[PDB]
Design a protein around this ligand. Structure first.
Ligand SMILES: CCCCOc1ccc(C[C@H](CC)C(=O)O)cc1CNC(=O)c1ccc2ccc3cccc4ccc1c2c34
Ligand SMILES: CCCCOc1ccc(C[C@H](CC)C(=O)O)cc1CNC(=O)c1ccc2ccc3cccc4ccc1c2c34
Lengths: 265, 265
């Protein structure tokens, strides 16, 4: 349909406008101001002095390396929350929802969207960081002391299988919109209107995958499963973050993310 | 360092001296000879009769409205090229470069600088024009016939995110200097000296952002990404201008801008 093709294009354009990183851009960088490679402690500290200088400008009062990394991770999440919040306005019906339902959908959806989109900047060896200006190796992240090395590998495991689906940005934009439109989120006021909004987005996603990936007749049910996998990945991630919060006094959690996690799992 | 703080101040002062519009001045006007508002064809024609009278003094031989606007756009670029060329003399090492390298750096840099600086006079509803004496609405520019309505919106999209960084003129001056000092421009003779000049400016920019924006530890990598975004914005802009040149006989391109675009993309 013209209105359904147009809806898919509108969501794709809103994704291209509101997220600083997209998959085409990420793959250009990942192929080879080129990205500084962080693969050990020396190169981590070098990258920090150039890319987050204030974070390491405190001398002997600088935090432990793992805590500095954790802080950088949190800051990226706060930025993506801002991007996701503006993107959601392109979803038909989202801006017509009650303000409290908009909050609830974004609360439960943002981390599922975050890890879906982080797949775009990950390969089997590492990931882009710092607005495309660093590449940090998967092995270096595994080398961090517990519990910080435990954040990383489950997301790589998810991303490698997600990337094997060979989605492009036109697919991922609709997938992220579908994540945001989940009517079964706890605490929703107008569940019925949200289910209809969801049905509309999922309908556009199904038709789009049919046109864009004629070679994979299971791609839509596969992505439905990936949405469930992401919900579980986020539940587990929240649990690990709570361990870090309780056992690592220096790993302070940003207030916006504290509110997202609050009463989640 | 005293010499690095002084370098940042020197570039800021050169920016204040050489560009007719700056962000403080622009925000004063944009808040409210006040700016005449161009929001439709009637008010466009009124503004033209006062601000560019010769352009509409030909009666039935006047060009189409979209072509007149395109001509005004080009004239602003020619003026900014003059301003940028004098500004570049404040960059340490630029005036010591070979004349041909100075030309090459300005050739590839001016339109990236132009769209970075135009952000200062843009808000979500429109932009200042005509030396602060007009404000033209974003919706009116979208209303122009194709292909002229296609020039405008990508620059607003860039500017809204660029302006959300809340840079001031002391930041933007160093950013524009960094744009001009790109050592990877095609055809450079003394790449090594240019990379050292670039390193010096980028070093001053990094330290300045650290001092001036202690609240945003990612601001430097964000601006590195904006430089890449601007390069792509300019590539796309050159392509659209070439379409207009081929398909619109009345939209003659000024010879100086023709030389800038020649062998660019
Ligand atoms: C898991 C596999 C991806 C690893 O990444 C994540 C992990 C978790 C989350 C969710 C967070 C967890 C606290 C949240 O619960 O909210 C987010 C990310 C994104 N992490 C990053 O983008 C990132 C990483 C490591 C770094 C190391 C050195 C660096 C130097 C300078 C700038 C950097 C910017 C971004 C840097 C970075 C930087
Ligand atoms: C894109 C969003 C900004 C729109 O603007 C641009 C677009 C492109 C470029 C680059 C040009 C394209 C050909 C180049 O490739 O070189 C430059 C600009 C600046 N454009 C302007 O400053 C501007 C606009 C529209 C107008 C409408 C009516 C007017 C009446 C009287 C005086 C005016 C002065 C300046 C007027 C004006 C005037």
């Amino acid at each position: 349909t013209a209105d359904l093709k147009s809806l898919a294009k509108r969501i794709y354009e809103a994704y291209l406008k509101n997220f600083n990183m997209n998959k085409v851009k990420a793959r250009v960088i990942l192929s080879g101001n080129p990205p500084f490679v962080i693969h050990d402690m020396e190169t981590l500290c070098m990258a920090e002095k150039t890319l987050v200088a204030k974070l390491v400008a405190n001398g002997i009062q600088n935090k432990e390396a793992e805590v500095r990394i954790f802080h950088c991770c949190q800051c990226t999440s706060v930025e993506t929350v801002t991007e996701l919040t503006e993107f959601a306005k392109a979803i038909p019906g989202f801006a017509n929802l009650d303000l409290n339902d908009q909050v609830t959908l974004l609360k439960y959806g943002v981390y599922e969207a975050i890890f879906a989109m982080l797949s775009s900047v990950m390969n089997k060896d590492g990931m882009l960081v710092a607005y495309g200006n660093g590449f940090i190796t998967r092995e270096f992240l595994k080398s961090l002391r517990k519990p910080f090395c435990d954040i990383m590998e489950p997301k790589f495991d998810f991303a490698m299988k997600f990337n094997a689906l060979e989605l492009d940005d036109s697919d991922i934009s609709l997938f992220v919109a579908a994540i945001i439109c989940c009517g079964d989120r706890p605490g929703l006021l107008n569940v019925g209107h949200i289910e209809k909004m969801q049905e509309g987005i999922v309908h556009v996603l199904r038709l789009h995958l049919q046109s864009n990936h004629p070679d994979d007749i299971f791609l839509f049910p596969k992505l439905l499963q990936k949405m469930a996998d992401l919900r579980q990945l986020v539940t587990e991630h929240a649990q690990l973050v709570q361990i870090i919060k309780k056992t690592e006094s220096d790993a302070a959690l940003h207030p916006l993310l504290q509110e997202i996690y609050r009463d989640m799992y």
